[PDB]
Amino acid sequence: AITGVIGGSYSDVSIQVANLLRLFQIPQISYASTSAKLSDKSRYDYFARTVPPDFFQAKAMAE
Amino acid sequence: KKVLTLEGDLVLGGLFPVHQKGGPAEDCGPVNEHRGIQRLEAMLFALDRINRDPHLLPGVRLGAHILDSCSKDTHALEQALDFVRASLITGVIGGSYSDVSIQVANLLRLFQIPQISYASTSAKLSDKSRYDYFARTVPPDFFQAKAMAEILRFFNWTYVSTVASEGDYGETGIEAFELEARARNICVATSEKVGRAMSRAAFEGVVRALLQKPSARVAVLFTRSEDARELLAASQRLNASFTWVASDGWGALESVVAGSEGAAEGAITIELASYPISDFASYFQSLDPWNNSRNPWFREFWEQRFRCSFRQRDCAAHSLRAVPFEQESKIMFVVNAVYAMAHALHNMHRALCPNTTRLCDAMRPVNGRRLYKDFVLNVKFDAPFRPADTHNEVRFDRFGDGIGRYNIFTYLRAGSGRYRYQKVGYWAEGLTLDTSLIPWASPSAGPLPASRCSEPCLQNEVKS
Amino acid sequence: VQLVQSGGGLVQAGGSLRLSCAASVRFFSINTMGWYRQAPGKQRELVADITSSGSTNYADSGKGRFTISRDNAKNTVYLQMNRLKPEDTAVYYCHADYKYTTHNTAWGQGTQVTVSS
Amino acid sequence: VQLVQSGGGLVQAGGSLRLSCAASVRFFSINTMGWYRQAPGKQRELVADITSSGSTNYADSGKGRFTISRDNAKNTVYLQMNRLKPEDTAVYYCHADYKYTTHNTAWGQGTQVTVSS
Ligand SMILES: N[C@@]1(C(=O)O)CC[C@H]2[C@H](C(=O)O)[C@H]21
Ligand SMILES: N[C@@]1(C(=O)O)CC[C@H]2[C@H](C(=O)O)[C@H]21
Numbered sequence: 001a002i003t004g005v006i007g008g009s010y011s012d013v014s015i016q017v018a019n020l021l022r023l024f025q026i027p028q029i030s031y032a033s034t035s036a037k038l039s040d041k042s043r044y045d046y047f048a049r050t051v052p053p054d055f056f057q058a059k060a061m062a063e
Numbered sequence: 064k065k066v067l068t069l070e071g072d073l074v075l076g077g078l079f080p081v082h083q084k085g086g087p088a089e090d091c092g093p094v095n096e097h098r099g100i101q102r103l104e105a106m107l108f109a110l111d112r113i114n115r116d117p118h119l120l121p122g123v124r125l126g127a128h129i130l131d132s133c134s135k136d137t138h139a140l141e142q143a144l145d146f147v148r149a150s151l152i153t154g155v156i157g158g159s160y161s162d163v164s165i166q167v168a169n170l171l172r173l174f175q176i177p178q179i180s181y182a183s184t185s186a187k188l189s190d191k192s193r194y195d196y197f198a199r200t201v202p203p204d205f206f207q208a209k210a211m212a213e214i215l216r217f218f219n220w221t222y223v224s225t226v227a228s229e230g231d232y233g234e235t236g237i238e239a240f241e242l243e244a245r246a247r248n249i250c251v252a253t254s255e256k257v258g259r260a261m262s263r264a265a266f267e268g269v270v271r272a273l274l275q276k277p278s279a280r281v282a283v284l285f286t287r288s289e290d291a292r293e294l295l296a297a298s299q300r301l302n303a304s305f306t307w308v309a310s311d312g313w314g315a316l317e318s319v320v321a322g323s324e325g326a327a328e329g330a331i332t333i334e335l336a337s338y339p340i341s342d343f344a345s346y347f348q349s350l351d352p353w354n355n356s357r358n359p360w361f362r363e364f365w366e367q368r369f370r371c372s373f374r375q376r377d378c379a380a381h382s383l384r385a386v387p388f389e390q391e392s393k394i395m396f397v398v399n400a401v402y403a404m405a406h407a408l409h410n411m412h413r414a415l416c417p418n419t420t421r422l423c424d425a426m427r428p429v430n431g432r433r434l435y436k437d438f439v440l441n442v443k444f445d446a447p448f449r450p451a452d453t454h455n456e457v458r459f460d461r462f463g464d465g466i467g468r469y470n471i472f473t474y475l476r477a478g479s480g481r482y483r484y485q486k487v488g489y490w491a492e493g494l495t496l497d498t499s500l501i502p503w504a505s506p507s508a509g510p511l512p513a514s515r516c517s518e519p520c521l522q523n524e525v526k527s
Numbered sequence: 528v529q530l531v532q533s534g535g536g537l538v539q540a541g542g543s544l545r546l547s548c549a550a551s552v553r554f555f556s557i558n559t560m561g562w563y564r565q566a567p568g569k570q571r572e573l574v575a576d577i578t579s580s581g582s583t584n585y586a587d588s589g590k591g592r593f594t595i596s597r598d599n600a601k602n603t604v605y606l607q608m609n610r611l612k613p614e615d616t617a618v619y620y621c622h623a624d625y626k627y628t629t630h631n632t633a634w635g636q637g638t639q640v641t642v643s644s
Numbered sequence: 645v646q647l648v649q650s651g652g653g654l655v656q657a658g659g660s661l662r663l664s665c666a667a668s669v670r671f672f673s674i675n676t677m678g679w680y681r682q683a684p685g686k687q688r689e690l691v692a693d694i695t696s697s698g699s700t701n702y703a704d705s706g707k708g709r710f711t712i713s714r715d716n717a718k719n720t721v722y723l724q725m726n727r728l729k730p731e732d733t734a735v736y737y738c739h740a741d742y743k744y745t746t747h748n749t750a751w752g753q754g755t756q757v758t759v760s761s
Contacts, residue, residue: 016169022137023144041529042260043136055627087620087634089567191646205744206671229629238745258631264559264576264584265624265632461646461668 002026007047011035018047064090064131064138065359066145069110071126072422073429075404076146078139078157078167079103081131081360084259084289091133094364097318098159098288101347101390102181102397103129103358106156108346109398109447113405120409122420128152131360132163134289135259139163143170150174153408153429156400158199159393160287161185161232168197175431177438179404181396184311184335186235189462196435198463200399201335204232204285204310208239210333210469210490211283211308216247217496218504220514222278224252226269226294227285228312229259236285236310250516252279257290266290266297274303280514283308288316295323306330306503306512314392315472315484324482327474329503329512336468336489337395338455340448348384392470395446399457399465402447406457407438414441439463467491475502528555528625530635539643544608548621548635552602559624560597560604564617571620575606611642645672647738647752653725657759661725665738665752669719676741677714677721680751683734691736692723728759 005021007030008014014033021028022045030038030049038044039053068074081099082091094100110127113119128146132139139158146152147170155171155178158164164183171178172195180188180199188194189203215223225240227233233256241251253273258265273282284291284307291313298304304325309332313319320327352365352373365371371378411434416423439459446455458466468491472484488496498504504511520527534545550557561576561584574586575595585593594607604621618637625631651663667674678693691703692710702710709726721738735754742750 019136019140019166019169023140086565086569086571087563087622088565088618088637092565092568093570229631235745242745256629258629260632260634261630262561262563262571262622262624262632263573264561264578264622265630268558268578268624268626269630 004028006031007049008033011038014038014047015044018044021046064141067127067129067358067360069127069357071114071124073123073153073408074126074128075401076152076155076157077103077106077127077129078132078142078155078159078163079106079129080134080159080163081364082133084134084287085138087260090138091131091135094360094367095134096364096368097316098391098393099131100361100364102159102393103360104347104350105340105343105394105397106401107358108343109401112342112447113402119402119405120412123408123412123422125405125408129157132157132159134160134163136162136166140166140170143167147171147174147176150176152176153431153434154179154404156181156397156404158183160230161188161235162230164188164197164199165194165231168194171431172196176429177404177407177431177435179400179438181400182311182393183232185231186239187231189464191462196431198403198435198439198459200396200403200457200465201311201393202465202467203462204236205239206467207310207333207469208236209243210471210494211240211310212243212247212249213490213494214331214333214471214496215244215249215281215283215308217494218511218513220281221248222250222252222516223308223514224273224276224279224282225254225285226273226282227256227310228287228290229256232287232310232312233257233285240283240285252276253282257286257294261290261293263293263297263300266293267301269294270297270301270303274301278514278516280512281306281308283310284313285310287312288319292319292321292323295319295327299323299326307332309333311335311392315470316391317389317482320474320482324474324479325477328477329501330474331487331501332472332474332484333469333490334392334472335396336470336491337392338450338453339390340394340398341450342448343390343394343398344388348382348388350383396465398447402444403438403442403457403459406442406444407434410441411437471496473501528553528557528623528633530621530623530633532619532621532635532638535638535640537641538611540611540613542608542611544611544640546606546608546619546621546638547603548605549601549603550623550633555625555627557602557623557625560622562593562595562604562606562619562621564615564619566617569617572617574619577604608640613642613644615640615642645670645674645740645742645750647740647750649736649738649752649755652755652757654756655725655728655759657728657730657761659725659728659759661728661757663723663725663736663738663755663757664720665723666718666720667740667750672742672744674719674740674742677719678739679710679712679721679723680737680739681732681734682737688737694721725757730759730761733758 004027009032011033028047034051036053083093086092130142158180159182164180178197184204186203186205227237307330314334352362369381471488487500532548534547536544559578563571565571575593576584577597597604618639653661676695680688682688692712711724714721740750
């Protein structure tokens with residue numbers, strides 16, 4: 001049993017592996033995927049990442 | 064979660080939105096009485112027709128593993144996982160919504176088994192570099208936005224609004240519509256998106272955000288069925304009456320105007336160009352909740368349609384033949400998809416087993432790659448249950464899509480006794496409208512609702 | 528935005544209940560917040576809602592009941608049960624509308640209530 | 645769009661060769677079409693390109709070589725092997741630029757162009 005995955009760096013790979021891990025009931029962390037779409041825990045109950053989502057960076061760039 | 068399975072030599076999967084969008088309590092709530100159940104029964108009817116067809120798989124009886132997507136990506140992906148548990152079926156005739164088909168293709172290409180969709184028209188599904196083991200009888204939705212832009216230019220609707228759903232259908236549709244409207248001198252007033260788990264208040268706020276620009280007298284739609292219904296209800300509650308331009312999500316569906324037929328009058332919608340099957344109606348009308356124990360979703364639909372209660376055994380006299388029945392613009396597509404899968408299997412059988420009729424040793428392990436390659440090119444047959452007038456046939460192009468043809472309907476006849484749509488034109492490599500059938504477009508009744516920034520001022524005195 | 532609920536309780540008909548539902552701001556402007564009631568496998572039905580501007584909405588048969596009160600500082604709603612009915616066995620869910628390029632609506636967990644005779 | 649290729653050929657040094665690359669129109673305005681070369685597991689290098697308007701560029705070592713000809717009617721690009729060498733043993737590809745809300749580039753299959761002694 002993998003018992004968790006350190007996840008991908010990009011976002012599409014991250015959402016795909018998060019879907020597959022949700023299918024198989026496997027936790028997941030991430031380190032580089034900063035997409036805000038992954039913050040929706042209704043679609044990705046797993047995938048708790050150590051990086052902030054996209055809208056923080058978007059507000060930073062707007063400022 | 065119930066499983067529907069048929070017995071056959073080789074079984075093919077299917078994913079149909081039998082239940083509507085999932086509520087906060089369960090994974091999926093009410094039953095799609097018009098889209099899920101009708102398409103499911105049409106697939107079953109076409110499979111029964113193929114099993115009795117001597118020219119299409121005579122000795123090979125093909126089964127079914129049709130399941131419910133519950134109008135949600137999570138449930139659809141769980142059912143696709145139940146599909147791929149064998150390789151962890153041969154094909155999958157499934158996927159109505161865009162994201163459902165996206166995730167199903169992502170999971171099925173991983174196991175190399177084909178998929179022929181019947182309702183998902185998303186453009187990103189045509190990307191064979193990402194979804195190679197996928198096809199569909201419906202054409203993509205980037206020239207559907209072209210048809211919408213041509214309709215808007217036909218009525219001189221420049222300053223228009225936009226509304227769509229998040230995911231893979233609304234985004235690509237709005238992108239194509241904007242790209243084809245910037246080239247046709249048609250502007251976007253408000254570019255917005257709606258979510259999946261929504262409420263009445265969110266759609267009321269959406270209508271309020273669209274009402275602060277009175278110049279945008281028309282809003283194009285790329286939403287789903289439930290989103291369009293909720294938007295119509297919110298516009299009816301807020302007394303907002305303006306024509307809409309709907310995508311395949313609304314189409315010619317009567318469940319969207321259920322209760323909100325006032326705020327939907329005179330809305331030009333675009334559906335797929337199809338025809339009513341003269342044999343599927345006789346099949347669906349002859350269905351009963353007791354003589355059709357093959358599908359428990361049919362029992363649930365019977366219970367939720369006629370306000371039944373099987374614990375009370377009261378509605379033992381209802382029947383589909385008594386109530387009026389209306390097919391969809393996708394029943395033709397689901398039967399074309401299952402017939403294309405059957406023709407692909409038949410050609411693969413006659414190519415790998417040129418002597419016998421049943422499956423062979425080289426046929427029991429069905430290679431999805433070779434099956435898809437034999438399907439995309441060696442499938443060209445007249446459409447099943449096709450009227451004697453048309454010469455329509457099922458042909459999959461290089462991208463595994465259908466021919467580009469759409470019908471244009473409008474909601475008219477404000478009388479409560481004849482609430483219906485009306486086909487006014489067809490779009491096939493060109494725009495064709497008949498304004499004599501549209502009530503508001505005819506000059507005798509009144510001028511058409513214009514949507515522009517400012518009035519067309521005359522050059523005589525005031526300049527531009 | 529995530530939603531948390533509290534105030535389950537267990538009493539017969541005619542009692543009082545305090546359904547509290549809180550959320551996290553996360554610099555999100557929740558413009559509308561309300562409640563829905565439904566059963567597993569059925570359609571949702573609105574019973575109370577406040578758009579954070581004094582304007583409130585109720586159900587078609589619960590105009591005089593279901594007193595809802597929301598706060599903007601703590602971002603929390605409170606619903607009262609003046610008179611309980613046996614037909615109120617459905618489970619409740621508090622929703623909050625947030626508009627960040629999606630106009631999505633976030634729900635919470637279900638607090639099943641029971642009204643006896 | 646899909647990019648089909650033909651004219652692989654197995655010729656020696658100093659020979660002639662014709663590599664054709666066609667595509668499907670699909671009412672798409674392909675604004676740029678060119679060729680590329682690379683080895684399995686390495687980076688890609690441009691060798692020739694035409695923007696369908698006259699601007700034609702090549703590689704740093706193929707200025708006087710890799711004669712190309714295209715037409716906006718059939719959307720086909722033909723490349724000729726002017727002078728062969730044992731250094732172009734890599735497999736070639738052709739790309740087409742279409743701008744439909746993505747600005748994506750569509751590639752084609754592999755064509756084995758090798759020159760020996
Ligand atoms: N910004 C990305 C992201 O998904 O958050 C997309 C591309 C890439 C960064 C990385 O690999 O560290 C990550
Ligand atoms: N227009 C959709 C699509 O994905 O192409 C999204 C919503 C829905 C239509 C259907 O179920 O027939 C399909």
